[PDB]
Amino acid sequence: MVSQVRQNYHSDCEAAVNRMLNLELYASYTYSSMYAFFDRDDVALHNVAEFFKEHSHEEREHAEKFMKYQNKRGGRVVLQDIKKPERDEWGNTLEAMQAALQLEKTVNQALLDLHKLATDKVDPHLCDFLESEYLEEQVKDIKRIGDFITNLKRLGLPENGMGEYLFDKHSVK
Amino acid sequence: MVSQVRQNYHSDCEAAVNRMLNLELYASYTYSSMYAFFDRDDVALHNVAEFFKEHSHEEREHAEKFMKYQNKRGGRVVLQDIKKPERDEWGNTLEAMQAALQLEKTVNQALLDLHKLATDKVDPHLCDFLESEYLEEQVKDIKRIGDFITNLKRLGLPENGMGEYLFDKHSVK
Amino acid sequence: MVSQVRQNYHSDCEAAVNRMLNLELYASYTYSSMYAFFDRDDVALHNVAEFFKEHSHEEREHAEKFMKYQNKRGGRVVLQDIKKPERDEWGNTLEAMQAALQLEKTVNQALLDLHKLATDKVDPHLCDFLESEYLEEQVKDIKRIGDFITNLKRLGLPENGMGEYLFDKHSVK
Amino acid sequence: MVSQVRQNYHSDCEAAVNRMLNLELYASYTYSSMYAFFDRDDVALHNVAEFFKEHSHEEREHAEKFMKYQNKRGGRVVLQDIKKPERDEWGNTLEAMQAALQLEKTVNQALLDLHKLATDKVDPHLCDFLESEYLEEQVKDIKRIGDFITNLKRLGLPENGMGEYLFDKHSVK
Amino acid sequence: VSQVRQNYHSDCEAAVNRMLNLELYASYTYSSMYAFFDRDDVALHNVAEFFKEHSHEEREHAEKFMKYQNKRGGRVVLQDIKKPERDEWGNTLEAMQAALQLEKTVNQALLDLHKLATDKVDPHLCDFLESEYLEEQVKDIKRIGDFITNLKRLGLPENGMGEYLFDKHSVK
Amino acid sequence: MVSQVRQNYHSDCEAAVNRMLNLELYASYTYSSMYAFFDRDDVALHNVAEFFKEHSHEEREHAEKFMKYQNKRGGRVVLQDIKKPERDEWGNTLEAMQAALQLEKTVNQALLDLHKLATDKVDPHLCDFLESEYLEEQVKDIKRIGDFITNLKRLGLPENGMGEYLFDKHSVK
Ligand SMILES: [Fe+3]
Ligand SMILES: [Fe+3]
Ligand SMILES: [Fe+3]
Ligand SMILES: [Fe+3]
Ligand SMILES: [Fe+3]
Ligand SMILES: [Fe+3]
Ligand SMILES: [Fe+3]
Ligand SMILES: [Fe+3]
Ligand SMILES: [Fe+3]
Ligand SMILES: [Fe+3]
Ligand SMILES: [Fe+3]
Ligand SMILES: [Fe+3]
């Protein structure tokens, strides 16, 4: 039955890592959709699209990390469908940064939930993995999205076309 | 109603490009699974694993290109679920490669069919884009895999571990 | 009497390439007019002027390729008056991008009509040249200019002058 | 209603500058036609062809300079049709060079006529522009074309093929 | 049938084979021209070197077809490379005029294969031919017609001084 | 009549050099066929394929040297059909290396016969040429090939797949 390498690894932590994986993939795809929206000719915000495209890659990397992690602890990667995103169309920069804030908070909650599971099962290696690789990155992302949303409001979104334009030239590279 | 940018881009073609988009993502996902499989402690063929990982990256780039294309032509990217792979475990390098051959031939047939679609709808721009960016790349990837399967059979797979071993040290980086 | 080099080049095609060459010069001249317009002291949008100046040179260079292509296949360049552009005056950046877009689609449709002539005449060399040198650049320019228009409208044009100053500093090289 | 920048610029000179610009474009167009003639497979004199291709770029830049000059002085650029050149077919390197001689002398007279007008209308800036930017380059080009014609006659043109061939290898770069 | 073959008509396979032989033929003919211009009593060394370069260029076209055949999963089958038409090529003009003719014949062969590939709805083959042969062919025909015009201008066949000059100036 | 350059070149030697030339071309063609066979997807031994490829280039260099030699001595290159190789299919690395040895020996026997002919016609020059440029290269080629075949046999050809695989990675590199 069990991997020659498995040690102190609970079944449930294994399953949780598979859930978290798929969730990282769901996040990726969502962002990949924003990139396509912001590259549309009637949207035309190139730096905002590039920003979501980057995040989309950040997220896909986060997933791989879980695959690697699973194999290392001797658990077995089991894949589920990656569900299409909530919307096909994202309104504008602020609607999108707002979706992004929730998507990040959702995923951060799953993380913190998995950390709690790991503490309950006394798997310090999983706790620390999450602490070093994920937890601090979500708190930077959320803080950076928060800052954007604030600035986007400052710029008079949703209504102020010129403020949306400025944001794209000045807050992303 | 129609995009300011659309010219000579038939509704049908637009829809096929979204189908094609879903296929590249589907394939990238399959290769991802194959990568995680070979990385398992009880498979442990690092170089085969890395081969499939680089391929799931190649297929993800293929996907992004259709996204970029759709918007260039003034179509709208509409996303579906990404289906999980046919399998959760891939047997061994031979079995994995036969499945890779299959997947590349399926994807190829879909590209041939879109080429046909686009010919009938008299779309030279889309025809060329298929020729330059997909068609040739596909025959290359398919010949490579055929070569590998032959070499894999030469090395006495499935039965022959020393064979599978040598393959991973020699036929891939 | 028949070029020694001529092979598989139908005379309607030769005729059409000459026609296409003239439209190429026309688009070039139009962009030249816009260049002169944005350099007026009462217009004074210099980045906009330069962009059209570069376009003026891109088209002149498309014209040049046709003369070569004509001689390469053994056809014979016949030139025709280059007609002055539609307007002596172009309103503002938005008005001009909008004309440009119209012109790029006219030139595009003319390229597509020629690609049809060549397909009917079973001339794959000319089909290929068109696809490789012209067809893709056209969709890139149409996408691009659409993208600009979107941004122009976002920025409050034709009414918003600040909106206009900014486009000229940021959207355009 | 008069541009804020205009000072000492007679309207006659404004018209005359528009007429001049159009001559430079005419000259340009003629040189293109010589370029394409010498590139024909039944003419095949590559260096002579390139020589004319360069002169047609130099005349294009002469037109650009007049556009700039109009705006600088506060005048308004008004464009006409650029007329097809006088021939479709240029004989041989001699006849072409004789035609270029007549073309440069024509454009020269036009410049002197504009100088006289400018002297009459007491516009010393327009004079000086003419003297620094056009007048001396016109005498050089004419001297240069002079010389070439004298050499084609020496080399036995129109009848001596071998003459024509050497000129292409030696007299032009 | 090959584990790699997909959408590749038997007929095309055969034509690709027919075509390879043509490339080799052309190559062999240029090689013969090199020998000719290298003769002591012809001795136009640059014109020789130009034909020797061409027969390499051709032998590379032959190779590319072999590689294509295998990529599509077809099977290379070779035939006798038939010897060139002439053992002696008169002079630079005759030679260049034969080379034009040959270039046109190989080009037609290529056009016929593109047509066949179009009829069998094989875009990969079309694009290969478009990308790798048709455009190199029009360049070659042009360059060659350019040489012929210049040779006639130089008074060939009669004028030796002309032939001499051509070998010094027109070819690298 | 006789070439201005001919001296001590017996006419039978001139014929044999022509005969020799065809042999070299012929060998070239056989090695080409071996190239294509090893590049087959169901054969797929790329390094063995590249070896035969290089070898057919080498043999064409040989044939050219004979054209050069022929003209140096004043004889006249006469060309024959290059017969197609003896098989369309080479079975495997061992069979092909065996065919290579026979072919290299047939060519060597021919070069010997020619040396013997030139010794009898008292043509030291032709003797030196066959010695400097061919005879020693033949014994190297033959030693390399017999080495190979010994190793193919050692590695268990034709039966052993892993043997053939290894040979391709280490004996040709
Ligand atoms: Fe994440
Ligand atoms: Fe995240
Ligand atoms: Fe793909
Ligand atoms: Fe693929
Ligand atoms: Fe254009
Ligand atoms: Fe354009
Ligand atoms: Fe001028
Ligand atoms: Fe001039
Ligand atoms: Fe060829
Ligand atoms: Fe050729
Ligand atoms: Fe040899
Ligand atoms: Fe040999």
Experimental method: X-ray
Dihedral sign, Cα of residue C68, residue C70, residue C72, residue C76: negative
The residues near E136 (Cβ < 8 Å, ≥ 6 apart) are none
As to burial, measured by CB atoms within 10 angstroms (0-12 exposed, 13-18 middle, 19+ buried), residue C38 is: buried
**CATH number of the domain residue C88 falls in:** 1.20.1260.10
Cα A114 from Cα A16, distance rounded (Å): 7
Ligand 8 center from residue D140 Cα (angstroms): 9
CB of C167 closer than 8 Å to CB of C151? yes
Are E40 and F3 in contact (CB < 8 Å)?
yes
Are B129 and C136 in contact (CB < 8 Å)?
yes
CB of E126 closer than 8 Å to CB of E117? yes
Cα C147 from Cα C145, distance rounded (Å): 5
Question: Under an 8 Å CB criterion, which residues of E touch C?
Answer: 100, 104, 107-108, 111, 114-115, 118, 126, 129-131, 134-135, 138-139, 141-142, 145, 148
CB of E5 closer than 8 Å to CB of E74? yes
Question: Under an 8 Å CB criterion, which residues of D touch C?
Answer: 3-5, 25, 29, 32-33, 35-37, 39-42, 60, 67-68, 70-71, 74, 76-85, 88
CB of E66 closer than 8 Å to CB of F35? yes
Nearest residue to A168 via CA among A103, A92, A55: A92
Q: Which residue among C147, C148, C156 places its CB closest to the CB of A161?
A: C156
Q: One-letter amino acid identity for F81?
A: D
Calculate how close chain B gets to E126, using CA atoms only, in Å.
9
DSSP letter at E82 equals P
Interior CA angle at D101 toward D99 and D104, to 5°? 110
Centre a 10 Å sphere on the Cβ of residue F132 and count the other Cβ atoms it contains. Answer: 10
Q: Give Cα B134 to chain centroid, integer Å.
A: 10
Are E123 and B130 in contact (CB < 8 Å)?
yes
Phi, psi (degrees; rounded to nearest 5) at F128: -60, -45
- The count of domains in chain A is 1
Peptide linkage before B158 cis (omega within 30 of 0) = yes
Give the pair of three-digit tokens for residue A61.
């990397």
Q: Give Cα B8 to chain centroid, integer Å.
A: 28
Chain C residues with CB-CB distance to B129 below 8 A: 136
Nearest residue to E99 via CA among E42, E137, E153: E137
Cα B65 from Cα A136, distance rounded (Å): 32
3-state secondary structure of D36: helix
Interior CA angle at E27 toward E23 and E29, to 5°? 120
Give the pair of three-digit tokens for residue E93.
């003009």
CB of E28 closer than 8 Å to CB of E81? yes
Alpha helices in chain D (DSSP H): 11-39, 46-73, 93-120, 124-130, 136-154, 161-170
CB of A172 closer than 8 Å to CB of C166? no
Cα F15 from Cα B73, distance rounded (Å): 67
Is position A80 annotated in a ligand binding site? no
- Which ligand is in closest contact with the Cα of B24? 3
Subunits with 3+ C-beta pairs closer than 8 A to C: A, B, D, E
As to burial, measured by CB atoms within 10 angstroms (0-12 exposed, 13-18 middle, 19+ buried), residue B137 is: middle
Annotated binding-site members of F: 24, 59, 62, 104, 138, 141
Cα F130 from Cα F65, distance rounded (Å): 11
Annotated binding-site members of B for Fe cation: 24, 59, 62, 104, 138, 141
As to burial, measured by CB atoms within 10 angstroms (0-12 exposed, 13-18 middle, 19+ buried), residue D124 is: exposed
As to burial, measured by CB atoms within 10 angstroms (0-12 exposed, 13-18 middle, 19+ buried), residue A109 is: exposed
DSSP letter at D8 equals S
CB of F95 closer than 8 Å to CB of F102? no
Backbone region of residue A91 per phi and psi (left: phi > 0; alpha: psi in -120 to 50; beta: other values) = left
Q: After which residues is chain C broken (C to N over 2.5 A)?
A: none
Cα F42 from Cα B141, distance rounded (Å): 15
Centre a 10 Å sphere on the Cβ of residue B74 and count the other Cβ atoms it contains. Answer: 21
Is position E56 annotated in a ligand binding site? no
The residues near C127 (Cβ < 8 Å, ≥ 6 apart) are B124, C115, C118, C119, E130
CB of F129 closer than 8 Å to CB of F149? no
Helices B161-170 & B93-120 angle (0-180, nearest 10): 50
As to burial, measured by CB atoms within 10 angstroms (0-12 exposed, 13-18 middle, 19+ buried), residue E105 is: middle
Give whole-number Cα distances, C123 to B41, B155, B168, C127, in Å.
58, 48, 47, 6
Is position C141 annotated in a ligand binding site? yes
Cα B51 from Cα B173, distance rounded (Å): 8
For chain C, give the secondary structure using H, E and C: CCCCCCCCCCHHHHHHHHHHHHHHHHHHHHHHHHHHHHCCCCCCCHHHHHHHHHHHHHHHHHHHHHHHHHHHHCCCCCCCCECCCCCCCCCCHHHHHHHHHHHHHHHHHHHHHHHHHHHHCCCHHHHHHHHHHHHHHHHHHHHHHHHHHHHHHHCCCCCCHHHHHHHHHHCCC
CB of F36 closer than 8 Å to CB of F101? no
Is position A137 annotated in a ligand binding site? no
DSSP letter at A84 equals P
Q: One-letter amino acid identity for D89?
A: E
Q: One-letter amino acid identity for D40?
A: R
Task: Give the DSSP per-residue string, chain B.
Answer: ---TT-SS--HHHHHHHHHHHHHHHHHHHHHHHHHHHHTSTTT--HHHHHHHHHHHHHHHHHHHHHHHHHHHHT------PBPPPS-S---SHHHHHHHHHHHHHHHHHHHHHHHHHHHHTT-HHHHHHHIIIIIHHHHHHHHHHHHHHHHHHHTTTTT-HHHHHHHHHHT--
3-state secondary structure of E81: strand
CB of A6 closer than 8 Å to CB of A73? yes
Q: One-letter amino acid identity for B115?
A: H
Calculate how close chain B gets to F171, using CA atoms only, in Å.
14
Q: State this model's resolution in angstroms.
A: 2.7
The residues near B69 (Cβ < 8 Å, ≥ 6 apart) are B17, B126, B129
Q: Give Cα D66 to chain centroid, integer Å.
A: 13
Q: One-letter amino acid identity for E168?
A: K
Q: Which residue among E150, E155, E165 places its CB closest to the CB of D44?
A: E150
Cα F144 from Cα D156, distance rounded (Å): 65
Phi, psi (degrees; rounded to nearest 5) at E12: -65, -50
The residues near C5 (Cβ < 8 Å, ≥ 6 apart) are C72, C73, C74, D41, E141, E142, E145
Cα C124 from Cα D161, distance rounded (Å): 37
DSSP letter at E121 equals T
- Which ligand is in closest contact with the Cα of C130? 5
**Containing structural domain, residue B84:** 1-173
Peptide linkage before D85 cis (omega within 30 of 0) = no
CB of A139 closer than 8 Å to CB of A105? no
Dihedral sign, Cα of residue D45, residue D46, residue D47, residue D53: positive
Cα E90 from Cα E100, distance rounded (Å): 15
Task: Give the DSSP per-residue string, E137-167.
Answer: HHHHHHHHHHHHHHHHHTTTTT-HHHHHHHH
Cα B49 from Cα D45, distance rounded (Å): 59
Question: Under an 8 Å CB criterion, which residues of E touch F?
Answer: 2-4, 28, 31-32, 34-36, 38-41, 52, 59, 63, 66-67, 69-70, 73, 75-84, 87
Cα A48 from Cα A96, distance rounded (Å): 10
Give the pair of three-digit tokens for residue A77.
């990667």
Nearest residue to F24 via CA among F77, F66, F74, F52: F66
Chain E residues with CB-CB distance to B116 below 8 A: 121
Centre a 10 Å sphere on the Cβ of residue F44 and count the other Cβ atoms it contains. Answer: 25
Subunits with 3+ C-beta pairs closer than 8 A to A: B, C
The residues near F68 (Cβ < 8 Å, ≥ 6 apart) are E38
Calculate how close chain B gets to F42, using CA atoms only, in Å.
6
Give whole-number Cα distances, F17 to F6, F14, F92, F114, F135, in Å.
15, 5, 33, 8, 15
Greatest distance between any 2 Cα atoms in chain F:
63
CB of C112 closer than 8 Å to CB of B124? yes
- Overall size of chain F counted in residues: 173
Give whole-number Cα distances, E172 to E44, E55, E160, in Å.
12, 16, 19
CB of E70 closer than 8 Å to CB of E64? no
| Intra-chain end-to-end CA distance of chain D, in Å | 51
Alpha helices in A39-135 (DSSP H): 46-73, 93-120, 124-130
Cα C143 from Cα C165, distance rounded (Å): 22
- Surrounding residues of ion ligand 5, Cβ less than 5 A: C 59, 62, 107
CB pairs < 8 Å spanning B and E: 39
Cα A1 from Cα D112, distance rounded (Å): 100
As to burial, measured by CB atoms within 10 angstroms (0-12 exposed, 13-18 middle, 19+ buried), residue A2 is: exposed
Ligand 7 center from residue D150 Cα (angstroms): 22
Cα A10 from Cα A92, distance rounded (Å): 44
Q: Which residues pair with F82 in a beta bridge?
A: E81
Centre a 10 Å sphere on the Cβ of residue C89 and count the other Cβ atoms it contains. Answer: 13
DSSP letter at A62 equals H
Cα C83 from Cα C103, distance rounded (Å): 14
Chain A residues with CB-CB distance to C160 below 8 A: 162
Q: Which residues pair with B82 in a beta bridge?
A: A82
Give the pair of three-digit tokens for residue F113.
């016969």
CB of E84 closer than 8 Å to CB of F79? yes
CB of E158 closer than 8 Å to CB of E110? no
Helix (H) or strand (E) holding E115: helix E92-119
CB of C29 closer than 8 Å to CB of C88? no
3-state secondary structure of A82: strand
CB of D146 closer than 8 Å to CB of D137? no
Q: Which residues pair with A82 in a beta bridge?
A: B82
Phi, psi (degrees; rounded to nearest 5) at C109: -70, -35
Chain E residues with CB-CB distance to B130 below 8 A: 123
